[PDB]
Amino acid sequence: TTTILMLPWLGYGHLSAFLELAKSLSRRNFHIYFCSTSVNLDAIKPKLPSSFSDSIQFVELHLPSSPEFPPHLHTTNGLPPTLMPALHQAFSMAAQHFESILQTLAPHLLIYDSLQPWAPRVASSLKIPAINFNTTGVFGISQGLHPIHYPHSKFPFSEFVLHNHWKAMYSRTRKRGEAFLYCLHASCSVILINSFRELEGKYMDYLSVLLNKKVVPVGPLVYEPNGYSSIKNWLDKKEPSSTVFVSFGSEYFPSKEEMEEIAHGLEASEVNFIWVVRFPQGDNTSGIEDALPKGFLERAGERGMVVKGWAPQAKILKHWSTGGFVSHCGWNSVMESMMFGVPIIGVPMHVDQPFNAGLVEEAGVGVEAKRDPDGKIQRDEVAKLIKEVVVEKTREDVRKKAREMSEILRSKGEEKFDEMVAEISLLLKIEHHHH
Numbered sequence: 001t002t003t004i005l006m007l008p009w010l011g012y013g014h015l016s017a018f019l020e021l022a023k024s025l026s027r028r029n030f031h032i033y034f035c036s037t038s039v040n041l042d043a044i045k046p047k048l049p050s051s052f053s054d055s056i057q058f059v060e061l062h063l064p065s066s067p068e069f070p071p072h073l074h075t076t077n078g079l080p081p082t083l084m085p086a087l088h089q090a091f092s093m094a095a096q097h098f099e100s101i102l103q104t105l106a107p108h109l110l111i112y113d114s115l116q117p118w119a120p121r122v123a124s125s126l127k128i129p130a131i132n133f134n135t136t137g138v139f140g141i142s143q144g145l146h147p148i149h150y151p152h153s154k155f156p157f158s159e160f161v162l163h164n165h166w167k168a169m170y171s172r173t174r175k176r177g178e179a180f181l182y183c184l185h186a187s188c189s190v191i192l193i194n195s196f197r198e199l200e201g202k203y204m205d206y207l208s209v210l211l212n213k214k215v216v217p218v219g220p221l222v223y224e225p226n227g228y229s230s231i232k233n234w235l236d237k238k239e240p241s242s243t244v245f246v247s248f249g250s251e252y253f254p255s256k257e258e259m260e261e262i263a264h265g266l267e268a269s270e271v272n273f274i275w276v277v278r279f280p281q282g283d284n285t286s287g288i289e290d291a292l293p294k295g296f297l298e299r300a301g302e303r304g305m306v307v308k309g310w311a312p313q314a315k316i317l318k319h320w321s322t323g324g325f326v327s328h329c330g331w332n333s334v335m336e337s338m339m340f341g342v343p344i345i346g347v348p349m350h351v352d353q354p355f356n357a358g359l360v361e362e363a364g365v366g367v368e369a370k371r372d373p374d375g376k377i378q379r380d381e382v383a384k385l386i387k388e389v390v391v392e393k394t395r396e397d398v399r400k401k402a403r404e405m406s407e408i409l410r411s412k413g414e415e416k417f418d419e420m421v422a423e424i425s426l427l428l429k430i431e432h433h434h435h
Protein backbone atom coordinates (compact mmCIF):
# COMPACT_ATOMS: atom_id res chain seq x y z
CA THR A 1 0.00 0.00 0.00
CA THR A 2 1.30 3.45 -1.00
CA THR A 3 1.50 5.87 1.95
CA ILE A 4 1.07 9.65 1.65
CA LEU A 5 1.78 12.26 4.37
CA MET A 6 -0.22 15.44 3.75
CA LEU A 7 0.86 18.76 5.31
CA PRO A 8 -1.68 21.50 4.91
CA TRP A 9 -1.13 25.14 5.87
CA LEU A 10 -2.76 26.00 9.26
CA GLY A 11 -5.83 27.73 7.73
CA TYR A 12 -9.26 26.08 7.87
CA GLY A 13 -9.78 26.52 4.10
CA HIS A 14 -6.45 24.83 3.35
CA LEU A 15 -7.18 22.03 5.87
CA SER A 16 -10.65 21.53 4.36
CA ALA A 17 -9.26 21.23 0.80
CA PHE A 18 -6.47 18.89 1.94
CA LEU A 19 -9.05 16.66 3.72
CA GLU A 20 -11.25 16.40 0.60
CA LEU A 21 -8.13 15.42 -1.43
CA ALA A 22 -7.17 12.87 1.28
CA LYS A 23 -10.62 11.25 1.01
CA SER A 24 -10.21 10.98 -2.79
CA LEU A 25 -6.78 9.28 -2.44
CA SER A 26 -8.15 6.92 0.26
CA ARG A 27 -10.74 5.72 -2.31
CA ARG A 28 -7.82 5.04 -4.74
CA ASN A 29 -6.00 2.59 -2.37
CA PHE A 30 -3.68 5.12 -0.70
CA HIS A 31 -3.06 5.35 3.08
CA ILE A 32 -3.00 8.96 4.28
CA TYR A 33 -1.17 10.47 7.23
CA PHE A 34 -2.88 13.84 7.76
CA CYS A 35 -0.55 16.12 9.70
CA SER A 36 -1.40 19.40 11.43
CA THR A 37 -1.60 21.13 14.79
CA SER A 38 -3.90 19.59 17.38
CA VAL A 39 -6.28 22.57 17.36
CA ASN A 40 -6.67 22.18 13.59
CA LEU A 41 -7.09 18.40 13.75
CA ASP A 42 -9.86 19.02 16.33
CA ALA A 43 -11.63 21.43 13.98
CA ILE A 44 -11.41 19.18 10.91
CA LYS A 45 -12.06 15.72 12.43
CA PRO A 46 -15.89 16.19 12.49
CA LYS A 47 -15.73 16.46 8.67
CA LEU A 48 -14.23 12.97 8.31
CA PRO A 49 -16.75 10.10 8.24
CA SER A 50 -16.02 7.00 10.31
CA SER A 51 -15.55 4.84 7.19
CA PHE A 52 -12.14 6.49 6.59
CA SER A 53 -10.71 5.51 10.00
CA ASP A 54 -8.68 2.64 8.53
CA SER A 55 -7.16 4.68 5.68
CA ILE A 56 -6.71 8.26 7.02
CA GLN A 57 -4.69 8.75 10.22
CA PHE A 58 -4.35 12.11 11.95
CA VAL A 59 -0.81 13.02 13.02
CA GLU A 60 0.00 15.86 15.39
CA LEU A 61 2.54 18.52 14.43
CA HIS A 62 4.06 20.47 17.34
CA LEU A 63 4.78 24.23 17.10
CA PRO A 64 6.84 26.16 19.69
CA SER A 65 4.51 27.04 22.55
CA SER A 66 4.40 29.75 25.24
CA PRO A 67 1.64 31.09 27.52
CA GLU A 68 1.55 34.16 25.28
CA PHE A 69 1.06 31.99 22.14
CA PRO A 70 -0.40 28.71 23.40
CA PRO A 71 -1.39 25.75 21.22
CA HIS A 72 -5.07 26.65 20.91
CA LEU A 73 -3.94 29.65 18.83
CA HIS A 74 -1.86 27.54 16.42
CA THR A 75 -4.31 28.13 13.56
CA THR A 76 -5.43 31.06 11.48
CA ASN A 77 -9.04 30.25 12.37
CA GLY A 78 -10.25 33.25 14.42
CA LEU A 79 -6.63 34.29 15.08
CA PRO A 80 -6.07 37.94 15.96
CA PRO A 81 -4.52 39.33 12.74
CA THR A 82 -1.61 40.80 14.75
CA LEU A 83 -0.60 37.20 15.60
CA MET A 84 -0.38 36.06 11.95
CA PRO A 85 3.40 36.85 11.68
CA ALA A 86 4.02 34.82 14.85
CA LEU A 87 1.99 31.93 13.42
CA HIS A 88 4.01 31.83 10.21
CA GLN A 89 7.25 32.00 12.20
CA ALA A 90 6.16 29.27 14.61
CA PHE A 91 5.12 27.08 11.66
CA SER A 92 8.60 27.39 10.16
CA MET A 93 10.00 26.29 13.53
CA ALA A 94 8.15 22.95 13.30
CA ALA A 95 10.57 21.67 10.63
CA GLN A 96 12.62 19.66 13.17
CA HIS A 97 9.56 17.91 14.54
CA PHE A 98 8.29 17.40 10.97
CA GLU A 99 11.54 15.64 10.11
CA SER A 100 11.15 13.29 13.07
CA ILE A 101 7.60 12.48 11.92
CA LEU A 102 8.82 11.68 8.40
CA GLN A 103 11.55 9.51 9.89
CA THR A 104 9.11 7.56 12.08
CA LEU A 105 6.35 7.12 9.48
CA ALA A 106 8.54 6.90 6.34
CA PRO A 107 5.76 7.77 3.87
CA HIS A 108 6.28 7.10 0.18
CA LEU A 109 5.08 10.59 -0.76
CA LEU A 110 4.74 14.04 0.83
CA ILE A 111 1.95 16.34 -0.36
CA TYR A 112 2.59 19.82 1.08
CA ASP A 113 0.90 23.24 0.95
CA SER A 114 2.34 26.42 -0.58
CA LEU A 115 3.31 28.20 2.68
CA GLN A 116 6.13 25.92 3.90
CA PRO A 117 9.33 25.95 1.85
CA TRP A 118 11.00 23.96 4.64
CA ALA A 119 8.74 20.98 3.92
CA PRO A 120 10.04 19.87 0.48
CA ARG A 121 13.56 20.57 1.79
CA VAL A 122 13.08 18.10 4.70
CA ALA A 123 11.57 15.51 2.31
CA SER A 124 14.46 15.80 -0.19
CA SER A 125 16.96 15.26 2.66
CA LEU A 126 15.15 11.96 3.50
CA LYS A 127 14.76 10.89 -0.19
CA ILE A 128 10.96 11.25 0.07
CA PRO A 129 9.31 12.56 -3.17
CA ALA A 130 7.18 15.63 -2.49
CA ILE A 131 4.40 17.30 -4.45
CA ASN A 132 2.89 20.72 -3.88
CA PHE A 133 -0.91 20.85 -3.53
CA ASN A 134 -2.01 24.45 -3.97
CA THR A 135 -5.51 24.80 -2.51
CA THR A 136 -6.41 28.06 -4.24
CA GLY A 137 -6.76 28.97 -7.91
CA VAL A 138 -4.31 29.73 -10.71
CA PHE A 139 -5.68 33.09 -11.90
CA GLY A 140 -4.08 35.16 -9.14
CA ILE A 141 -0.70 33.44 -9.33
CA SER A 142 -0.48 33.92 -13.08
CA GLN A 143 -1.78 37.51 -12.90
CA GLY A 144 0.90 38.23 -10.32
CA LEU A 145 3.78 36.45 -12.02
CA HIS A 146 3.31 37.74 -15.59
CA PRO A 147 4.19 41.44 -14.90
CA ILE A 148 7.50 40.55 -13.23
CA HIS A 149 8.75 39.06 -16.52
CA TYR A 150 6.70 41.15 -18.95
CA PRO A 151 5.93 44.55 -17.38
CA HIS A 152 5.04 46.08 -20.76
CA SER A 153 2.87 43.28 -22.22
CA LYS A 154 -0.83 42.96 -21.50
CA PHE A 155 -1.77 39.83 -19.57
CA PRO A 156 -3.19 37.46 -22.16
CA PHE A 157 -6.90 36.45 -22.39
CA SER A 158 -8.22 38.67 -19.56
CA GLU A 159 -9.32 42.27 -19.12
CA PHE A 160 -8.90 42.13 -15.33
CA VAL A 161 -7.09 45.05 -13.67
CA LEU A 162 -5.95 44.92 -10.06
CA HIS A 163 -7.17 47.95 -8.07
CA ASN A 164 -4.41 50.30 -6.81
CA HIS A 165 -5.37 49.39 -3.20
CA TRP A 166 -3.97 45.84 -3.61
CA LYS A 167 -1.12 46.93 -5.94
CA ALA A 168 0.21 49.09 -3.04
CA MET A 169 -0.35 46.22 -0.54
CA TYR A 170 1.64 43.68 -2.64
CA SER A 171 4.35 46.23 -3.64
CA ARG A 172 9.09 41.17 3.48
CA THR A 173 6.44 41.07 0.68
CA ARG A 174 9.16 39.86 -1.74
CA LYS A 175 10.25 37.19 0.80
CA ARG A 176 6.65 35.91 1.21
CA GLY A 177 6.19 35.79 -2.59
CA GLU A 178 9.55 34.02 -3.15
CA ALA A 179 8.71 31.44 -0.43
CA PHE A 180 5.22 30.84 -1.95
CA LEU A 181 6.61 30.47 -5.50
CA TYR A 182 9.41 28.24 -4.20
CA CYS A 183 6.86 25.73 -2.90
CA LEU A 184 5.37 25.52 -6.38
CA HIS A 185 8.69 25.53 -8.21
CA ALA A 186 10.26 22.86 -5.93
CA SER A 187 7.42 20.41 -6.44
CA CYS A 188 8.43 17.02 -7.86
CA SER A 189 7.23 16.66 -11.49
CA VAL A 190 3.73 18.20 -11.10
CA ILE A 191 1.81 20.83 -9.13
CA LEU A 192 -1.65 19.77 -7.98
CA ILE A 193 -4.13 22.63 -8.02
CA ASN A 194 -7.64 22.94 -6.58
CA SER A 195 -9.26 24.21 -9.78
CA PHE A 196 -10.95 22.99 -12.98
CA ARG A 197 -10.41 23.59 -16.74
CA GLU A 198 -13.88 24.97 -17.42
CA LEU A 199 -13.01 27.90 -15.12
CA GLU A 200 -9.21 28.30 -15.37
CA GLY A 201 -7.92 26.03 -18.17
CA LYS A 202 -6.20 28.72 -20.24
CA TYR A 203 -4.66 30.20 -17.08
CA MET A 204 -3.47 26.77 -15.96
CA ASP A 205 -1.67 26.33 -19.28
CA TYR A 206 -0.10 29.79 -19.07
CA LEU A 207 1.06 29.33 -15.46
CA SER A 208 2.59 26.02 -16.48
CA VAL A 209 4.55 27.93 -19.15
CA LEU A 210 5.60 30.69 -16.74
CA LEU A 211 6.78 28.21 -14.11
CA ASN A 212 8.09 25.57 -16.51
CA LYS A 213 6.16 22.99 -14.44
CA LYS A 214 3.28 20.67 -15.26
CA VAL A 215 0.01 21.74 -13.59
CA VAL A 216 -2.58 19.07 -12.69
CA PRO A 217 -6.15 20.07 -11.73
CA VAL A 218 -7.81 18.14 -8.83
CA GLY A 219 -11.14 19.87 -9.49
CA PRO A 220 -13.44 21.74 -7.21
CA LEU A 221 -12.99 20.00 -3.83
CA VAL A 222 -16.29 21.01 -2.16
CA TYR A 223 -17.28 19.59 1.23
CA GLU A 224 -20.95 18.73 1.38
CA PRO A 225 -22.43 18.07 4.88
CA ASN A 226 -25.30 15.65 5.53
CA GLY A 227 -27.55 25.69 14.46
CA TYR A 228 -29.16 25.23 11.00
CA SER A 229 -32.64 24.27 12.33
CA SER A 230 -33.29 27.80 13.69
CA ILE A 231 -31.82 29.27 10.48
CA LYS A 232 -33.86 26.99 8.24
CA ASN A 233 -37.07 28.03 10.04
CA TRP A 234 -36.30 31.68 9.30
CA LEU A 235 -35.31 30.98 5.69
CA ASP A 236 -38.38 28.85 5.01
CA LYS A 237 -40.51 31.96 5.63
CA LYS A 238 -38.76 33.88 2.83
CA GLU A 239 -39.51 34.03 -0.88
CA PRO A 240 -37.31 31.97 -3.23
CA SER A 241 -33.95 33.50 -4.24
CA SER A 242 -34.62 36.53 -2.03
CA THR A 243 -31.85 36.28 0.61
CA VAL A 244 -28.08 36.87 0.62
CA PHE A 245 -25.65 35.08 2.89
CA VAL A 246 -22.86 37.43 4.08
CA SER A 247 -19.51 35.99 5.16
CA PHE A 248 -15.84 36.91 5.18
CA GLY A 249 -14.41 33.45 5.80
CA SER A 250 -12.40 31.95 8.66
CA GLU A 251 -9.46 34.36 9.01
CA TYR A 252 -10.66 37.88 8.36
CA PHE A 253 -12.32 40.41 10.67
CA PRO A 254 -13.77 43.44 8.87
CA SER A 255 -13.02 46.74 10.56
CA LYS A 256 -15.82 48.75 12.16
CA GLU A 257 -15.76 51.09 9.17
CA GLU A 258 -15.94 48.19 6.71
CA MET A 259 -18.83 46.68 8.68
CA GLU A 260 -20.65 50.01 8.53
CA GLU A 261 -20.44 50.07 4.73
CA ILE A 262 -21.63 46.46 4.43
CA ALA A 263 -24.47 47.05 6.89
CA HIS A 264 -25.72 50.22 5.20
CA GLY A 265 -25.45 48.53 1.80
CA LEU A 266 -27.60 45.67 3.08
CA GLU A 267 -30.10 48.13 4.56
CA ALA A 268 -30.44 50.24 1.41
CA SER A 269 -30.83 47.13 -0.78
CA GLU A 270 -33.89 45.98 1.26
CA VAL A 271 -32.74 42.37 0.73
CA ASN A 272 -33.21 39.57 3.23
CA PHE A 273 -29.87 38.70 4.78
CA ILE A 274 -28.06 36.25 7.07
CA TRP A 275 -24.72 37.75 8.19
CA VAL A 276 -22.02 35.88 10.15
CA VAL A 277 -20.19 38.29 12.44
CA ARG A 278 -17.05 37.02 14.17
CA PHE A 279 -14.62 38.35 16.76
CA PRO A 280 -10.96 37.24 17.11
CA GLN A 281 -10.28 34.56 19.79
CA GLY A 282 -9.02 37.14 22.33
CA ASP A 283 -11.43 40.10 21.74
CA ASN A 284 -13.31 40.86 25.00
CA THR A 285 -15.11 43.92 23.57
CA SER A 286 -17.08 41.40 21.43
CA GLY A 287 -20.52 42.86 20.71
CA ILE A 288 -22.73 42.31 17.67
CA GLU A 289 -24.70 45.46 18.64
CA ASP A 290 -21.50 47.49 19.23
CA ALA A 291 -19.87 46.15 15.99
CA LEU A 292 -22.89 47.10 13.85
CA PRO A 293 -24.40 50.59 13.16
CA LYS A 294 -26.78 51.66 15.89
CA GLY A 295 -30.34 50.54 15.22
CA PHE A 296 -29.30 48.44 12.19
CA LEU A 297 -30.91 45.15 13.22
CA GLU A 298 -34.04 46.82 14.62
CA ARG A 299 -34.51 48.74 11.37
CA ALA A 300 -33.91 45.55 9.39
CA GLY A 301 -36.45 43.66 11.50
CA GLU A 302 -37.79 40.57 9.77
CA ARG A 303 -35.39 40.99 6.84
CA GLY A 304 -32.11 40.54 8.72
CA MET A 305 -30.51 37.85 10.88
CA VAL A 306 -26.98 37.97 12.36
CA VAL A 307 -25.22 34.70 13.30
CA LYS A 308 -22.38 34.97 15.84
CA GLY A 309 -19.20 32.97 15.28
CA TRP A 310 -19.74 30.29 12.70
CA ALA A 311 -22.58 29.53 10.34
CA PRO A 312 -23.54 26.42 8.25
CA GLN A 313 -22.40 28.09 5.05
CA ALA A 314 -22.97 25.17 2.71
CA LYS A 315 -26.46 24.42 4.01
CA ILE A 316 -27.44 28.09 3.72
CA LEU A 317 -26.13 28.41 0.16
CA LYS A 318 -28.16 25.34 -0.78
CA HIS A 319 -31.46 26.69 0.63
CA TRP A 320 -33.95 27.74 -2.05
CA SER A 321 -34.40 31.17 -0.45
CA THR A 322 -30.74 32.05 -1.07
CA GLY A 323 -30.33 34.23 -4.14
CA GLY A 324 -26.84 35.64 -3.62
CA PHE A 325 -23.62 35.37 -1.62
CA VAL A 326 -21.88 38.55 -0.40
CA SER A 327 -18.46 36.95 -0.04
CA HIS A 328 -14.88 37.89 0.66
CA CYS A 329 -14.15 35.57 -2.33
CA GLY A 330 -12.00 33.10 -0.46
CA TRP A 331 -11.45 30.22 -2.86
CA ASN A 332 -13.45 27.53 -1.08
CA SER A 333 -16.38 29.94 -0.74
CA VAL A 334 -16.24 30.73 -4.46
CA MET A 335 -16.09 27.00 -5.35
CA GLU A 336 -19.06 26.30 -3.02
CA SER A 337 -21.15 29.15 -4.51
CA MET A 338 -20.51 27.80 -8.04
CA MET A 339 -21.24 24.23 -6.95
CA PHE A 340 -24.57 25.30 -5.47
CA GLY A 341 -25.42 27.71 -8.29
CA VAL A 342 -25.49 30.90 -6.18
CA PRO A 343 -24.43 34.26 -7.72
CA ILE A 344 -21.51 35.88 -5.93
CA ILE A 345 -21.40 39.55 -4.94
CA GLY A 346 -17.67 39.94 -4.36
CA VAL A 347 -16.27 42.03 -1.53
CA PRO A 348 -12.63 40.84 -1.58
CA MET A 349 -10.37 41.88 1.30
CA HIS A 350 -6.81 40.60 0.86
CA VAL A 351 -4.39 37.89 -0.36
CA ASP A 352 -5.78 36.03 -3.44
CA GLN A 353 -9.32 37.41 -2.88
CA PRO A 354 -9.09 40.42 -5.29
CA PHE A 355 -7.87 38.06 -8.02
CA ASN A 356 -10.60 35.54 -7.20
CA ALA A 357 -13.24 38.27 -7.51
CA GLY A 358 -11.81 39.23 -10.89
CA LEU A 359 -12.05 35.64 -12.11
CA VAL A 360 -15.64 35.42 -10.80
CA GLU A 361 -16.49 38.57 -12.71
CA GLU A 362 -14.77 37.32 -15.87
CA ALA A 363 -16.51 33.93 -15.70
CA GLY A 364 -19.83 35.75 -15.29
CA VAL A 365 -20.96 33.81 -12.20
CA GLY A 366 -20.75 36.89 -10.00
CA VAL A 367 -20.17 40.63 -9.78
CA GLU A 368 -17.59 42.62 -7.78
CA ALA A 369 -18.34 45.59 -5.52
CA LYS A 370 -15.59 48.02 -6.52
CA ARG A 371 -13.66 50.00 -3.92
CA ASP A 372 -13.24 53.81 -3.98
CA PRO A 373 -9.96 55.36 -5.26
CA ASP A 374 -8.62 55.21 -1.66
CA GLY A 375 -9.38 51.49 -1.26
CA LYS A 376 -12.58 51.82 0.76
CA ILE A 377 -15.68 49.60 0.45
CA GLN A 378 -18.67 51.60 -0.81
CA ARG A 379 -22.15 51.11 0.65
CA ASP A 380 -23.65 52.41 -2.60
CA GLU A 381 -21.86 49.78 -4.70
CA VAL A 382 -22.87 46.99 -2.32
CA ALA A 383 -26.51 48.09 -2.33
CA LYS A 384 -26.61 48.50 -6.11
CA LEU A 385 -25.29 45.03 -6.89
CA ILE A 386 -27.56 43.28 -4.38
CA LYS A 387 -30.46 45.24 -5.88
CA GLU A 388 -29.62 44.22 -9.46
CA VAL A 389 -28.67 40.60 -8.77
CA VAL A 390 -31.09 39.60 -6.02
CA VAL A 391 -33.87 42.10 -5.29
CA GLU A 392 -34.91 43.50 -8.67
CA LYS A 393 -33.25 40.74 -10.77
CA THR A 394 -32.01 42.82 -13.70
CA ARG A 395 -28.78 40.74 -13.92
CA GLU A 396 -30.31 37.28 -14.64
CA ASP A 397 -27.23 36.42 -16.78
CA VAL A 398 -25.16 36.05 -13.54
CA ARG A 399 -27.74 33.58 -12.10
CA LYS A 400 -27.92 31.72 -15.46
CA LYS A 401 -24.09 31.33 -15.65
CA ALA A 402 -23.88 30.22 -11.98
CA ARG A 403 -26.57 27.56 -12.62
CA GLU A 404 -24.78 26.36 -15.76
CA MET A 405 -21.53 26.15 -13.79
CA SER A 406 -23.34 24.21 -11.06
CA GLU A 407 -24.55 21.67 -13.59
CA ILE A 408 -21.03 21.30 -14.99
CA LEU A 409 -19.56 20.77 -11.52
CA ARG A 410 -22.31 18.37 -10.44
CA SER A 411 -21.57 16.23 -13.50
CA LYS A 412 -17.98 15.56 -12.42
CA GLY A 413 -17.06 12.38 -10.62
CA GLU A 414 -14.07 10.29 -9.47
CA GLU A 415 -12.37 10.72 -12.85
CA LYS A 416 -11.48 14.21 -11.57
CA PHE A 417 -8.63 12.45 -9.73
CA ASP A 418 -7.37 10.13 -12.51
CA GLU A 419 -4.60 12.45 -13.70
CA MET A 420 -3.32 13.05 -10.16
CA VAL A 421 -3.22 9.33 -9.42
CA ALA A 422 -1.40 8.49 -12.65
CA GLU A 423 1.21 11.19 -12.05
CA ILE A 424 1.79 10.03 -8.47
CA SER A 425 2.20 6.46 -9.70
CA LEU A 426 4.70 7.48 -12.40
CA LEU A 427 6.75 9.65 -10.04
CA LEU A 428 7.05 6.87 -7.50
CA LYS A 429 8.04 4.32 -10.17
CA ILE A 430 10.74 6.66 -11.57
CA GLU A 431 12.06 7.59 -8.09
CA HIS A 432 12.33 3.90 -7.11
CA HIS A 433 14.73 3.35 -10.05
CA HIS A 434 16.88 6.36 -9.04
CA HIS A 435 16.78 5.09 -5.41
Ligand SMILES: O=c1ccn([C@@H]2O[C@H](COP(=O)(O)OP(=O)(O)O)[C@@H](O)[C@H]2O)c(=O)[nH]1
Nearest residue numbers: 013249250251276310311313330331332333
Ligand atom coordinates in the same frame (compact mmCIF):
# COMPACT_ATOMS: atom_id res chain seq x y z
O1 LIG B 1 -19.26 30.98 9.11
C1 LIG B 1 -18.58 30.30 8.33
C2 LIG B 1 -17.44 30.77 7.59
C3 LIG B 1 -16.77 29.95 6.75
N1 LIG B 1 -17.17 28.63 6.58
C4 LIG B 1 -16.43 27.74 5.68
O2 LIG B 1 -15.05 28.03 5.81
C5 LIG B 1 -14.41 27.91 4.51
C6 LIG B 1 -13.76 29.22 4.19
O3 LIG B 1 -12.74 28.95 3.26
P1 LIG B 1 -12.40 30.10 2.15
O4 LIG B 1 -11.37 29.55 1.20
O5 LIG B 1 -13.65 30.56 1.45
O6 LIG B 1 -11.82 31.43 2.91
P2 LIG B 1 -10.72 31.58 4.12
O7 LIG B 1 -11.34 31.16 5.42
O8 LIG B 1 -9.53 30.70 3.79
O9 LIG B 1 -10.29 33.02 4.15
C7 LIG B 1 -15.49 27.59 3.49
O10 LIG B 1 -15.54 26.17 3.27
C8 LIG B 1 -16.76 28.02 4.17
O11 LIG B 1 -17.84 27.18 3.78
C9 LIG B 1 -18.26 28.12 7.25
O12 LIG B 1 -18.62 26.96 7.12
N2 LIG B 1 -18.91 28.99 8.10
